[PDB]
Amino acid sequence: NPINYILGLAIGIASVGWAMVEIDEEENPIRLIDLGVRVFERAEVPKTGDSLAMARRLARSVRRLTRRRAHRLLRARRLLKREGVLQAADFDENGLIKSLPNTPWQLRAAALDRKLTPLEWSAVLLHLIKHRGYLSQRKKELGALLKGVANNAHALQTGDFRTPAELALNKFEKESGHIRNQRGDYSHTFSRKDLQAELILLFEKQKEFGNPHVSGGLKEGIETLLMTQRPALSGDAVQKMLGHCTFEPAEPKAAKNTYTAERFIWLTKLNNLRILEQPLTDTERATLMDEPYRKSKLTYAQARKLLGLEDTAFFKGLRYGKDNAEASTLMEMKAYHAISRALEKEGLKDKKSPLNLSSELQDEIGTAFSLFKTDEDITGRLKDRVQPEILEALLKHISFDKFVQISLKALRRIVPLMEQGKRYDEACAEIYGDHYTEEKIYLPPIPADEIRNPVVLRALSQARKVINGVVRRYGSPAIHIETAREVGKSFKDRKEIEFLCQFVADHILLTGKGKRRVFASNGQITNLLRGENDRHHALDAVVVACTVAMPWEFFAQEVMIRVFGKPDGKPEFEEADTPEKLRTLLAEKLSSRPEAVHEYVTPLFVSRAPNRKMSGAHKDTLRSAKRFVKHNEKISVKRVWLTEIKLADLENMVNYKNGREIELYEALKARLEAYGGNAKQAFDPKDNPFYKKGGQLVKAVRVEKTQESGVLLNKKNAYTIADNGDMVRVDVFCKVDKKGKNQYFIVPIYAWQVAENILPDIDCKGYRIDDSYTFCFSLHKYDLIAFQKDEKSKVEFAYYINCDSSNGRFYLAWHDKGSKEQQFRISTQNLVLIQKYQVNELGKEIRPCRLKKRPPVR
RNA sequence: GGUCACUCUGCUAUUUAACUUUACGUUGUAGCUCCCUUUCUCGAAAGAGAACCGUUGCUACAAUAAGGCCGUCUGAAAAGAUGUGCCGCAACGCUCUGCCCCAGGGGCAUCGUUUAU
DNA sequence: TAACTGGGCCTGTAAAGTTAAATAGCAGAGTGACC
DNA sequence: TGAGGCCCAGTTA
Incomplete structure (x- = not known):
């Protein structure tokens, strides 16, 4: 059983095609065997075009936000009880405060003029903590949040307003009628420092007025709860996000704001710089070399005059000859300079003289400030390595934020050779030998770490699945990549229009076609060469498959008839449903030299990847459910x-x-x-x-x-319901006892039910299922099913998409039928006389499958 | 010479992934508040007046996936105090498991990894 | 009175920051395989 | 920017 494959594959944003021929002697094809195509769905959200992981990240973010606010208020109430502001009788069974007033703004304003009840005081403190305002958190033209908060800060710094409460009440309420922000407006936001000032002033005034609970512990606790936030970056948060050094793989990348890396950039600039008069010798380079280190900013004109040069020869590669951008900085030694500035103003450094430090010390502080951002981590890396006065100054002033591609070891190895005059490539070749790729029978899993695009990543993982199915079934091949103009990087550009290269290059076989048995195709040529869409990706697959001068001829007509059984002419054609009508039909209609199908016979229908995840989420709108629960009215x-x-x-x-x-x-x-x-x-x-x-x-x-159905939320506290949403799967139920015909029932399973570990027993329109009903199977998104409408019908296999909760109707589509609006069909099944499951392999292995054990949810 | 690809540096544009927050919005419960169904009470009538429920506006508090878990103590256990407390809407894969399919070989996962205190 | 059917409507949001990474383009220094 | 969720009103067996 030997064959040889030069089968081509087409890449689309949602598609992948393949079609196999066997060119035997040397780059000269034969007739085709098993044409095919698979299709998936994008790694984006259809409407908005965001990433699916993005909604998940924002879910995580808001979950953490709400949890932390709840915990903050919980600890505030605990501190209130601990400091003796409230006694254990004032707290109810849930740990909340009984008869807690609903007048915190008025009380915050009156606290500057009179004493406050323990309950009024507690309400004020918890209200300050809850709405604790905006914190700058930053290392022009402001938007609307910043605009509003800055305006309010300026407002309570001018006149009649001692605190945000006074300004808020008087101005806001008499000018707008409400105190809070409303419907996306930011004009009532206060800066957290203004509220901190309110807190200090309130504690002082309440102490004046004889408030008993003006404790130091209480003030410290309330102020801590108000001001404290977790660090945005802490620990190995930056390091985990770093890449790999080019030459030293076990070593991390060097920080851009280090003496070694900054001088490496400087040497690259200097050595690589050439002057044209109708390189630069070591003396002129060495003149300029240490100029930027203490000369503030080294522009190109200063370099020219520093070495003399002329007016007759030029320094290449610069635009804007008319506008004379010669003060465009040739080099700024920004890290050295920022460290010096910091130590100059705050600590001790003569501005005229050059600040000095072990070059390794500069490297350590640059690394520490690029890799760690909070003072705890920074000192924990700089405590034993250097001494504290400069450390305090640097902790207060410096902020560095980028990296380079070479490790500090490789840099310390390279920079010496570059100071001597040698180039980056020369130093790298002299050190690493100017040579710095296993092949396998199966293509191993794709790496995602080399490109941003989840669309492309998923597309190419599925491409790899498809080509590995080709490699498995139809032997190992000699593949002809072809990615579409839409497929590379889309949404804004794609909506307007409306990495694997290297991986395959290094990780899989080629059978001695000179250097390579691959052909990177150029689909433009495909559009030219061909001399409401179905599975149309045979085009790109084999036009990729078949090192041309670019216009050679062969004959087509067969290929069209194999791609579509109704093709090679008018589409009212019968479209052979079986493999043998395919072989007979194609053979006889092409009758001549039977170059084609006979033993190869291949009926194709697109392989659509299924979605059997159980994760999901209900709808985000909360609705009153008091009647839905107390009186069962829907x-x-x-x-x-x-x-x-x-x-x-x-x-x-x-x-x-x-x-x-x-x-x-x-x-x-x-x-x-x-x-x-x-x-x-x-x-x-x-x-x-x-x-x-x-x-x-x-x-x-x-x-x-x-509201026929839904999921109930906050059950311990309120009657609230939300739309079901995210039907993860729907399980079938087969029953015969219609006293006559045999009927089907479909019960839907949502995500909140897989979370609550409940398995429903109510058909969409039907009612309770007993032991009388017979479970047949269970299906998910994009599974293939057999479909016999009524008394007489072709069995008409088709893929399933949606289920209707009202009546159990099914949105369907078949091979090459993908456009939901254009091509979905919606069949009912109370009387469907047979609905069956199936499995479709990657290629076309359409073998029916069946299971009878009702799979529960966990 | 031409083309393509690759390493490094500078700038521009775009995209991805991770994290810290704020301000909303939605539901509920209080309170004050706009209307208003109904039922009652004082009424000989004219008319008043209460109550539940609905509900307009504002303020507060609670929830903000459904679901699950942590550290730290007073101590014998029930527990009770407490925390800058923690996962859960994605992608990918086949070491552990389950299913489905054809002693292997796969696909799909509720299995595993990014992923955690 | 129960299914079937074609149609159709509602779906969570904006803003402020720290980061790392990928693609593309331009400019600069090289390299390799091809044509 | 779109598709999932699922009801609505009219028709049909």
Whole structure:
């Protein structure tokens, strides 16, 4: 059983194609065997184009935020009890404070004029901690957050406002009518230092007025809780994110702000610099060499005049000849200079004289400040290595933030040769021998660490899966990469239009085609050479497969008929459903020299990768569920803003459907009619506010929404429900006893149910399943199923996408049918007479599968 | 000479991954508040007046995935005090396991890795 | 009275910082394999 | 910027 393969593969943003021929003698093809194609779905979010890992990272972030705020307030209450502000009777069973006032702003303002109750004081402290304002956290033209906070800081620094509470109450409430920020506005934010000042002033004033709980421990604890945050970077956070040195793989990259690395950059600039008059000898280089070290900034014109030069010869590679950008800095020794500045103003350094330190000491402090950012870590690396006065000055002034590509060892080895005049390549060759790649029968797993794009990463991991399936089944081959213009890097550019090279190069076989048995294709040529889309990727696959002058001929007609059974002419063709109609049809229609199918027979349909993850999440909107629980009526209630409302919501208003407020409904509907449904304009704030009967503003109204199912949240504390969302899988249930026909039932399983470890027993429209119902199987996203509509039908295998919770309907699509809007089909199955499972291998191994053990959730 | 690719340095644009925070928004519960269904009470009537529920606006507090776990102590156990406390919406893979498929060989995972105190 | 069907509507957000890394382009110094 | 979730109103067996 020997064959030989030169099968080509096509890469798309969501697709991968393959088609196998066997050119035998030397670069001269034969007829085809097993054409095929697989397809997946992108590593992005369809609507927004963000990364799926991005939503996950923001979930982690907000989880940590809420947890830390809860814990902060918890410790605040503990400190309140510990310092004797409140007694154990003032705390309820949940650990919350009973009769805690809801007037913290007014109390914060009155605390400058009178004494505060222990409960008023506790409310004030916890409110200050909870809304603890914005902290600069930074190492121009400000936006809106910074604008608002800076304006408020300037406002309480001028006149009638001693604290944010006074300014807040008086100005905010009398000018706007509310104190907090509303609907994305930032104009009421205070800087955390302003609130810290409020806290110190409040403690002092309360001590004046005879507050008993002005304890030092209490003040320290409240101030700590207010000010403390975790460091953004700590420990090995920077090191874990570093790359690998080019020559020394066991050694980390050197920091850009170190004497060694900065001088390495300087030497690269100097040695590589050439003057043109219609290189630079060691004396001129050595003149310029130590000039930037204490001369502040070395521009190119200063270098020219420093070495004399002329006006007749030039230093190559510079733009803007007319604008005379000769003061563009040739070199700035920024790390050395910043260290010197720091030690000059704060510590001890004569500005005229050059600050000095063991070159290794400069390297240590540069490394410590680039790799560690908090004072604890920095001193923990600089305590025993150097002494504390300079350490304090440097900790207070210096901040370095980038790296280079060569390790400190390799640099300390290279820089000497570069000072002597040798170049980077010459020094690297003299040291490492100017030679610095195992091949395998299977391509090993892809590395993701060499490119940002998850789209490309997933596309190429699936490309590797496909080519390794080719290598497994159809022997080892001689592959012809072909990546699309859309496939490389898309979204903004892709929406406007609407790494594997090296990996394969070094990690897999080539069978002696000179140097390489590969051909990197140029699909432009593919578009030219060919002399509402189905599985159309045969094109790029074999046009990649077949080192050309670029226009050689062979014949096509067969290939079209193998790609589509209805092809080689009009598409009303029968499209052979079996392999033997394929062989017969193609053979006889091409009758002539039977170069093609007979023994190879290959029916193709795209291999669509399935999604059987169990992870997921419910919807992020919280809705009232009091009626959903207490009276089991299948509705929820949610506020809707008037600027986003429509007549459907207006008719579903809570106080309209129960006739409570009919005239309010009439006025709102009247205004929305007056603008033809333009809710953004009918109820525009500060241009067209809506006023209820009696003069009260209306900004949003509660609207009822049909709630057949959902997940209940905060069950210990409230009646809240959220839409189910993220159906992870739906399990089938087969029952015959219709007294006659045999029926199907489908029960959906969501993510919150895989989290609560519950396995439902309610068919979408049907009701409870007993031991009478017979479980058939369970399917997920993008699984293949058999499909027999009714009495008479072709079995019509197709892939499954969605299930409808209302009636158990199924969104489907077949091979080459991918566009959801264009090509999904939606079949019902209460009477479907057979619905079956299947498996599709990478290539085309469409063998049915079946399991009868109902797989539970964990 | 031309082309392509690669190593290093400088600048520009874009993208990725990780972390610390703020301000919202949503739901609930209090309080004050705009309306308003219903039911009652005083009424001979005219009319008042209470109550639950709904609900407009503002303030506060709680929750903000569903689910699970940590360190530190007073000590015998129940526990009780306490923390700049910690994972959970992604991708990838086949050492441990489960399923599915064809003594191996795979695919998919609720298995494992990035991943943790 | 129960399914089937074509249609259709609602879905969490903005801002402020510390970082590392990848691609592309331009400029500068080299190298290799090809054509 | 889109697709999943799933209801709605009319029709049908």
